[PDB]
Amino acid sequence: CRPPMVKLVCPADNLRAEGLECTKTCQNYDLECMSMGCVSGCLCPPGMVRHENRCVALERCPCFHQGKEYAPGETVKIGCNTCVCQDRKWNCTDHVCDATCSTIGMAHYLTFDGLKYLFPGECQYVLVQDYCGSNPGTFRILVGNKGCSHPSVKCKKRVTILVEGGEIELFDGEVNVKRPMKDETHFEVVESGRYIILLLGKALSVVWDRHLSISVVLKQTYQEKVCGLCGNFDGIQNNDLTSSNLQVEEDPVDFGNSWKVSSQCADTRKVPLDSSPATCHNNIMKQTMVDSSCRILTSDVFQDCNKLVDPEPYLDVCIYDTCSCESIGDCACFCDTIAAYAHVCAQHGKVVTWRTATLCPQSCEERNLRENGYECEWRYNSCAPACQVTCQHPEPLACPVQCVEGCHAHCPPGKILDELLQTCVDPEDCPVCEVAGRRFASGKKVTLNPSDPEHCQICHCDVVNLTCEACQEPG
Amino acid sequence: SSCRILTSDVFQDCNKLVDPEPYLDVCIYDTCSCESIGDCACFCDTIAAYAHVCAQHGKVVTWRTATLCPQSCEERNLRENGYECEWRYNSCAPACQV
Amino acid sequence: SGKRYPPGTSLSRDCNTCICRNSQWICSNEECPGECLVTGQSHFKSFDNRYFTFSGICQYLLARDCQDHSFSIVIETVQCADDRDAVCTRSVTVRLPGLHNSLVKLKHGAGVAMDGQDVQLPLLKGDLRIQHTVTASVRLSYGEDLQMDWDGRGRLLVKLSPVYAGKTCGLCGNYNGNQGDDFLTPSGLAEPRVEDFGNAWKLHGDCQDLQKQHSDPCALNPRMTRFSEEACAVLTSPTFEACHRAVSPLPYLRNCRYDVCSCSDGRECLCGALASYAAACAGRGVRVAWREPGRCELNCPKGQVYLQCGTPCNLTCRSLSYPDEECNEACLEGCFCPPGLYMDERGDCVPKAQCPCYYDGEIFQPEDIFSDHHTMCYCEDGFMHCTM
Amino acid sequence: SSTARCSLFGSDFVNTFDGSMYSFAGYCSYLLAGGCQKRSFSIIGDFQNGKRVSLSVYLGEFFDIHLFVNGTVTQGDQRVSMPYASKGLYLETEAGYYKLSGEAYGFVARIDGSGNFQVLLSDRYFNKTCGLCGNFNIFAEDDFMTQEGTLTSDPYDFANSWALSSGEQWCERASPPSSSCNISSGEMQKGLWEQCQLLKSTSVFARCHPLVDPEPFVALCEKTLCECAGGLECACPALLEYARTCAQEGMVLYGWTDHSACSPVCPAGMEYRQCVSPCARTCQSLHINEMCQERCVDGCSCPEGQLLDEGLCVESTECPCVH
Ligand SMILES: *[C@@H]1O[C@H](CO)[C@@H](O)[C@H](O)[C@H]1NC(C)=O
Ligand SMILES: *[C@@H]1O[C@H](CO)[C@@H](O)[C@H](O)[C@H]1NC(C)=O
Ligand SMILES: *[C@@H]1O[C@H](CO)[C@@H](O)[C@H](O)[C@H]1NC(C)=O
Ligand SMILES: *[C@@H]1O[C@H](CO)[C@@H](O)[C@H](O)[C@H]1NC(C)=O
Ligand SMILES: *[C@@H]1O[C@H](CO)[C@@H](O)[C@H](O)[C@H]1NC(C)=O
Ligand SMILES: [Ca+2]
Ligand SMILES: [Ca+2]
Ligand SMILES: [Ca+2]
């Protein structure tokens, strides 16, 4: 018909004629097409396939992803995986990235493999642990809430991190090292922004928003060696509700009760399912207002992230929480459930700015005013590099989260911040010490090379002093 | 308990001049009837009213902490090419200036 | 599931067995048959228990044997009411490359038509045995590694034996016991939106792509909201309290609400949505009694009576003509008639005396005598006990 | 402009936002107007058997009011008083006609004495509304868009695609009623033909013609005139509508009812004043001028004296005190 195009005629001696009825465009090419005759119009030459009103000479045609066309050879990044498509399909890499627990809001959980469930407990529970079956194991993070079955202005959760034989439990927005870690070189607490990122090993970390948002970041090493309220981190999402007695369960509450640490505590009683949890129940007006308010997760500033991350789980969490929660002066049970989604978006590279003066204000001027003069180096920033070099951590750190939210101090170059003095000061005016002439630490109070005493020229620092004690010989 | 902030440590001086009982009843009534989701304003406003009344009597009150009606002011500087940082929150600064 | 069990018991997850030893369950780990379900307005359940909704209007590729090509199941959807959120399946098409490359088509009237011609069921062709069901359905069955189900109103169950595990691609997913990767497109890349995943599987380029998948059709017809709510609250009522621990009722509740607010006739959709959950509970083992005179007591002709747990093996007259054939079928919720009465060809079941004989298709008469010069046969009471 | 005026006048008659008159005699609730992408509100008009029974407004899906032609007005499921002011909707008797205003949502509905409906949608809903009154675009030829999104040409299919069944309505496709006129015509028609032709012949009606074409109005009154049981008034509905639409176009025609011999029905005591002030003079009212200067609206009010007192004209001397 059209001169680049060409027509055909239906042979009256067949049934699988496969004419214009079964046109083969790009995405139709792989698919299998079943017809009931033919139309005998004009179809592209049998070496090329129609695509956006043309006939692409040799097929090799674009590679759709998220409703977008990608020319061949182009690569797209998903997690740790680069994906380039040749003929027509992407041959991604096989790296497995760091998994991540989460306490989304006040009663929901999000396992390692990705599974939102609801479990409103009030006892202590095993969030994730390694003493799991045949494995010897190391760490035993536990989470314990208080009065949380009706979460309004209560349920200040507390974590207890029993790693390396040292209790590092954290509560009231303050990490509290109950007992020292045996090998303290791993342990490193990095208070940044609004978060208290904890580095408890070379393949384990904890980031905590100082109120309720607890999430454990595990690396490739573990890979089906853990179990607890966050499932067993194997990539299979169906079996994440296996109770403590090796039996997969259908109800989340039975699972949660099975993962309780103190048997003589109170089981959570199953509640009949209801769309409106507690106060949204008969007050349908309130339920509609709550729905519309939580609809901000699908708003003009969140459009970019909605294509990468599904907002439905976080929408459900927002609705449930701010229905059950009664907010009077602290509108925190609402703003936290959106800050969690913003944090996830930022972890995927989609930084979003959503706080306005009439919507979760988040002041940061109380730190500047403390100085007798206002010097103004503290400022909010949707998401800024969290894990930065200060006088307390003069050396760089491998660190789980890219950027976080909160009052991040910006101040002129060459005047690196120190945490104790909220001011930022020149590098010299810090207790940083170079014992081996290298930029190590604040003169690390760490024992060096005991099992080879031939090199044990042990040397420390307290403030700037290049102090050097002895290595007490056994005999 | 929340509206009880009117008879609190920072408001002790004002109560010697202005009785918080009308404002306490207003706070309770509004907060009960109000449904607050994203703006806890039907509470912060009923307290800001009492703070204003106290201020007009000579008792300036600072009550507004980072976990209670924060009221940030960074948006009047960031719009500039460089963060000039000249605006700030003041509990009671003169109104009709030059 | 929140109840104690003395040591030594042996529970079953309807495919595997668990033994209680030392307060721990030792459970077998065998692969199990998978079920892809297309129900309601546009509700899907994948092979790995991934519930979703997708209201697209085109011909979609539901499930294809994807490394070898022993079958391929294609579905076709149309708007099913006045709204724009009510998109239901009309007809389903199956290709059998192992059988002449033939093309079976289950139609909207619960009929069936192989390669254009209509077909009178049963059909015991080479491999596939299409025949009707107690509830006037159509049960396709290819070999023994595949099954299927009627497509009159727009429901469909596909059952695949574990010989197909991990080797099928379609709207139903890989069938690899992992729910995560079910939004997989032909280009081998999971798309985190149901609209894109659905649109990636349409067979025709002229079909309109879906842009937004609405969650509350109730908001275009507010007049319905209240009814829908109460109409579906039964799913959480003590009436279904028995099987809340066998299959969670949340997806079926959302599907019930969507179906009631969206479809044209709410009365039909309410009982087409409760029956889905009842069948899901009956799958695992729990039999629920949920019909009430208000709540859609199914009614079949006056000769028949509703049986909750019947015996679809000996009701039909044809059965008496082939007693050697085996019926390894469970009880099926439908209607039957007393054991002194057997189903007649016309449809009014009669005592086994006047019950014809189906020797080589051709139907004979309750005392017909078909003699010959070398053989002789006579239809006595549903089988020609006939000499040579 | 800034407003548009759908109107379900007469019996079974409908006048869309853009002026596409047609006839439809439904059997369940229908969708008068409301946005079709984002549905903040939805005016719904109910029928019983051809004859309309009420008007309804469904704010979101949490609030609903049912203002019945029989004066009755239920909220939700319970009969309420009048005036009513909840949820940002103000429901009150203005100029003797029940009125339901939602200026926050930009809509004003009204019911007069005989039972006619009248919806004044705003201008923000331009090209956005989607209902039995057709989309609010200036074009008047594409106003029969069904709910499927496809334009039709038979008014009954267009109207039936917008039926909104409920838990206890369950309505069905409706069909045009059989005509009985075709046997009964003749002697009456000789004089009847004048009632419709005066719509365009009469001088008072003769200046609307540059604004609104009168052919469809005479057409509809002519086709509804035959089934009249020997009466002049059986054509005055159209005339009334012709006035009202012509008034809405910005040129109100004065004193057309002097010799029309048909007058609108109004409560006893009040006469149909063409362009009466919407600002009444109730006995207990503060004399605040320059704050009650809204646009004039046609309707009926008390005589020159006789200030209002709870919908009953009483002389200015007998205004009762209240305590
Ligand atoms: C994956 O990519 C590599 C490197 O380009 C190529 O050698 C290999 O054939 C690809 N394999 C598949 C399964 O596409
Ligand atoms: C946030 O901080 C980052 C890193 O310091 C900086 O690059 C960026 O300009 C900041 N953005 C805003 C909005 O202040
Ligand atoms: C507010 O303005 C006053 C008047 O200049 C000044 O004295 C004061 O320092 C400012 N802020 C506070 C906290 O008082
Ligand atoms: C109004 O109409 C309703 C519904 O038909 C009827 O129940 C009621 O009695 C009527 N009330 C009046 C005052 O006519
Ligand atoms: C109204 O919207 C339609 C559909 O987008 C568009 O085709 C048309 O041009 C618009 N008309 C006006 C007057 O804006
Ligand atoms: Ca798992
Ligand atoms: Ca899968
Ligand atoms: Ca139009």
Tab-separated table of C-alpha atoms in Angstrom, chain B residues 3-78:
chain	number	residue	atom	x	y	z
B	3	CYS	CA	-4.017	22.023	77.412
B	4	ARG	CA	-2.635	22.011	80.965
B	5	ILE	CA	0.435	23.723	79.493
B	6	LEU	CA	-1.213	27.045	80.305
B	7	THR	CA	-0.514	26.448	84.005
B	8	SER	CA	3.079	25.370	83.385
B	9	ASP	CA	6.582	26.493	84.304
B	10	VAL	CA	7.040	29.147	81.617
B	11	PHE	CA	3.493	30.496	82.064
B	12	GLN	CA	3.686	30.846	85.859
B	13	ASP	CA	4.440	34.569	85.712
B	14	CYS	CA	1.597	35.401	83.342
B	15	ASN	CA	-1.082	33.628	85.383
B	16	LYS	CA	-0.498	36.148	88.158
B	17	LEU	CA	-1.986	38.741	85.772
B	18	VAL	CA	-4.361	36.912	83.409
B	19	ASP	CA	-6.505	33.987	84.508
B	20	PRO	CA	-5.893	31.011	82.170
B	21	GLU	CA	-9.332	29.481	82.858
B	22	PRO	CA	-11.176	31.046	79.885
B	23	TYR	CA	-8.306	30.056	77.619
B	24	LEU	CA	-8.103	26.619	79.208
B	25	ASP	CA	-11.792	26.014	78.494
B	26	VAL	CA	-11.325	27.264	74.932
B	27	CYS	CA	-8.327	24.969	74.442
B	28	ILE	CA	-10.214	21.928	75.711
B	29	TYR	CA	-13.326	22.676	73.649
B	30	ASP	CA	-11.466	23.328	70.411
B	31	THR	CA	-9.095	20.372	70.718
B	32	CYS	CA	-11.917	17.952	71.508
B	33	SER	CA	-14.155	19.117	68.676
B	34	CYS	CA	-11.276	19.642	66.227
B	35	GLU	CA	-9.876	16.752	64.206
B	36	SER	CA	-6.155	17.339	63.698
B	37	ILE	CA	-4.142	15.399	61.132
B	38	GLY	CA	-1.393	17.429	59.513
B	39	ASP	CA	-1.718	20.817	61.184
B	40	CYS	CA	-1.928	20.824	64.962
B	41	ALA	CA	-3.170	24.400	64.565
B	42	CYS	CA	-6.470	24.224	66.451
B	43	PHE	CA	-4.273	23.804	69.569
B	44	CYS	CA	-1.216	25.937	68.860
B	45	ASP	CA	-3.520	28.842	67.989
B	46	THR	CA	-5.539	28.593	71.205
B	47	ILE	CA	-2.252	28.700	73.104
B	48	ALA	CA	-0.730	31.470	70.981
B	49	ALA	CA	-3.766	33.579	71.859
B	50	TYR	CA	-2.984	33.292	75.563
B	51	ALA	CA	0.698	33.944	74.897
B	52	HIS	CA	-0.248	37.110	73.004
B	53	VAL	CA	-2.489	38.287	75.840
B	54	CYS	CA	0.324	37.675	78.321
B	55	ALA	CA	2.744	39.565	76.085
B	56	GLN	CA	0.511	42.633	75.876
B	57	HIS	CA	0.553	42.796	79.689
B	58	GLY	CA	4.356	42.948	79.779
B	59	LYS	CA	5.101	39.236	80.290
B	60	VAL	CA	6.756	37.908	77.139
B	61	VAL	CA	6.512	34.115	77.027
B	62	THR	CA	8.655	31.662	75.056
B	63	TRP	CA	6.818	28.348	74.795
B	64	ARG	CA	7.428	27.083	71.275
B	65	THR	CA	9.916	24.200	71.164
B	66	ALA	CA	10.936	21.835	68.374
B	67	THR	CA	8.365	19.227	69.472
B	68	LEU	CA	5.563	21.726	70.161
B	69	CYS	CA	4.373	23.906	67.262
B	70	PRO	CA	7.855	24.394	65.741
B	71	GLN	CA	7.177	27.325	63.334
B	72	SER	CA	10.319	27.364	61.196
B	73	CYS	CA	11.539	30.436	59.279
B	74	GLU	CA	14.136	29.203	56.787
B	75	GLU	CA	11.905	29.849	53.766
B	76	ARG	CA	12.524	33.615	53.806
B	77	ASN	CA	16.258	33.195	53.152
B	78	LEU	CA	16.701	30.133	50.929
